[PDB]
Amino acid sequence: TPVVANYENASMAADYIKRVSNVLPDIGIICGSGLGKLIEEIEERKVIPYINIPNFPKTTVAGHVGNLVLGSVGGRKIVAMQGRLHMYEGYSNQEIALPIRVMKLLGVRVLLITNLAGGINRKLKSGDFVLIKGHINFPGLGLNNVLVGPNQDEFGPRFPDLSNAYDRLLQQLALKIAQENDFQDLVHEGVYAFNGGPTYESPDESNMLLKLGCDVVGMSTVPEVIIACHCGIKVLAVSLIANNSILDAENDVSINHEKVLAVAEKRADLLQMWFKEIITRLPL
Amino acid sequence: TPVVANYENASMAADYIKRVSNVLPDIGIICGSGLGKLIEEIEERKVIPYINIPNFPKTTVAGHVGNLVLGSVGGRKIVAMQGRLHMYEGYSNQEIALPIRVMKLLGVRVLLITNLAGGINRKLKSGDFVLIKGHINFPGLGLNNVLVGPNQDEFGPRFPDLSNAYDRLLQQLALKIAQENDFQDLVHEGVYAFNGGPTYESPDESNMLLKLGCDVVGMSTVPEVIIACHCGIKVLAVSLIANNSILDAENDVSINHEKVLAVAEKRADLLQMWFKEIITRLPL
Amino acid sequence: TPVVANYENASMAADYIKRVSNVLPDIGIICGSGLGKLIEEIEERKVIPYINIPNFPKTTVAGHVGNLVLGSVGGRKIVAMQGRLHMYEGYSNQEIALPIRVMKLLGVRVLLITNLAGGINRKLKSGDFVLIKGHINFPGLGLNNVLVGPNQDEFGPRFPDLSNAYDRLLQQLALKIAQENDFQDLVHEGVYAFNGGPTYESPDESNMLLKLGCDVVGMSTVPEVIIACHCGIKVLAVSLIANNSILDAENDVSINHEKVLAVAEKRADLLQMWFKEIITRLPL
Ligand SMILES: Nc1ncnc2[nH]cnc12
Ligand SMILES: Nc1ncnc2[nH]cnc12
Ligand SMILES: Nc1ncnc2[nH]cnc12
């Protein structure tokens, strides 16, 4: 009744999308806030508002942009989510999962994701990038995993294994490209902690995450990764570090969304170029 | 309106059960998947589908077996749940609690529980058993405890103490019987971490649970233990170890439900015999 | 439809309150159970049952007292919540937040909060007080933060920073007053862990909280602190220690609500006097 992310409902959305554009995409992309410039450069693009697509989640309470964009990047066919859905806004498990399962039915085999996040590991500075190699899902441990509910068997198994959720060869490709352009000094690898949000982590929470072996903390990405891994889509996820929360606690410095967006502004053009090349070089 | 697990609603279920069978059970049992063979050996048994019992939770979305079975084991009178309710399927706190409170009103004084779980402690191997001596309830710490909601005063207190939830004399009895049959080399004791599920723990989550002093991790049992302790029912809970998740992470080996069920097949007959004897020897 | 804690709904409640009493309060207070004697000493007081105020949450399932009390303490104008709302009772994020946002619209600039809690740090004894200097919010990390949902922009920002949620000058004032009355030997400072509840922490959970750097654990206060910090209200929060859970685990001693209330009885008159003086000395 609130629309389950099942096979029938995802197929109705895919059918509408397929007859309004001619694109069969191979690659899906979800971009962090302030990091979406690539979506404006999509060639021969079709913009489809969420509100026009059967069974897509209602987003008018939050407002702001919400479109699916289809077209070509680097000669590859892609579908993009413009205006991300975050669980701290109150969206349900079924609302998060439906767009990813629609990507699957359209033919997406690889999903590329970027986000903004806080740095925990003392090696991370403002403006650095982290290739995510694993995660700690505090909502999942505490009975709010994105897959709680009946399993949708056509998409995947009841009990997924997440050992390979972050594709190893895609991490090596993203690192190689940073080396060819001489910005590998900005690129780290690390473990991502999912904090449901929307408050930033307190100083004592940051210090707990350091003891637990977390390198980065943020409020997104893990739900989409789990839905993708469930249905067999490979994932690359990159965090842009806004601040080092441990260092900020030692110096009594606050974090705010204005400072976050300025960091996004500083790195946006480098990230757009990086991901355009990753898309171009991605293995068939 | 979704049916609260209160005194009136539990009594209507108990009244139907009492007039369809003649069994006043003293012992309740909840068996892990693939571990239910004992329930087929119940003597002079009465099988009651959940769907026939007033106020029992609806389970048709998930499908598969769901019956209450009453009868005799080892000369003792028992009630069994055949087809367990798990919180990762989306059942509410009230749906989990009602069958246990029905057991209470029928006269159950001891609840025996088995499950499948992942090994964290490096001493545990595939096929070992763990007598649970305590737990870490990540859903409870994070506002999804099975008792969140109004308290049902006829069953127990607002703020239960869980210091004695896992009965010490029942652990010693289960260990004694393993010694008399010379399989005590398979039996450990340990602390159980509740992961809401349904994804298996990621490698970085497993390594966090090791740092936190957890010996075993699984997706069930803690909700039923808490409802039982609330209303004064003594508990014995045993985990069958499917794999050692820490060792699997070091060697890059995946876990899947097929491997889990094969372990259950390998130990099912030993576990049935063990629990039949525990039931026989249980103190009045 | 379950009544959102938005600007329009909070203003209707404030408007009713404002025309039934003549008090424009500067200070809000929320008192722990057994710790409410100060509210009976409020001078020229007006008692307003929650059930009479537009948009206030329904509390008849739990029963027991629920009033807002307005009047004067130490020459200062205050509003008190008599009968606290706890999230383990099943109240929603919107029900917790609405009374605090009503306090804001009435003119409250400082919120004083007391609670009962378990001691983790080995320096804490039954009957001690802890000035809270920071927190670890396990519900917030696990997608049950009090602010999950649409943001109410008139009250505060989408992503609050909690670095200064516990006002430093108010902690120094409360400590100074304990020194002037020679009971500073009872007063500590510490980090508070929020356990959703309503079961007390198990022995293995207590030992985990010790490893994570928590000094005290309880079932309240963090939700109200976060709503207050969101809308710019300064906070002082004090825990009264009922028992030391680590020492109790080593000696196999149970905790129960009866023992908790006896500790509250033993300290109630000292706490009332302390807070009356804090209220008197609070900076304009
Ligand atoms: N410190 C931080 N900076 C940016 N995004 C975040 N998400 C969570 N914590 C964050
Ligand atoms: N590794 C594992 N094996 C079996 N059951 C589990 N439940 C949670 N983790 C598990
Ligand atoms: N041990 C304890 N004593 C009193 N209140 C508590 N709240 C949580 N744990 C507590």
Author numbering:
A (entry chain A), B (entry chain A), C (entry chain A): 3 to 286
Give passages from the manuscript.
Purine nucleoside phosphorylase (PNP) (E.C 2.4.2.1) is an enzyme responsible for reversible phosphorolysis of purine nucleosides, generating ribose-1-phosphate and their corresponding bases.
Soaking experiments using high ligand concentration was employed, resulting in four new SmPNP2 complexes with adenine, hypoxanthine, tubercidin, and cytidine. Using a soaking approach, three complexes were obtained: SmPNP2–tubercidin (7-deaza-adenosine), SmPNP2–hypoxanthine and SmPNP2–adenine (The composite omit maps of these ligands can be seen in S6 and S7 Figs, respectively). The main reason for that is the steric constraints related to the presence of ribose group, which would argue against a similar conformation seen for adenine and hypoxanthine.
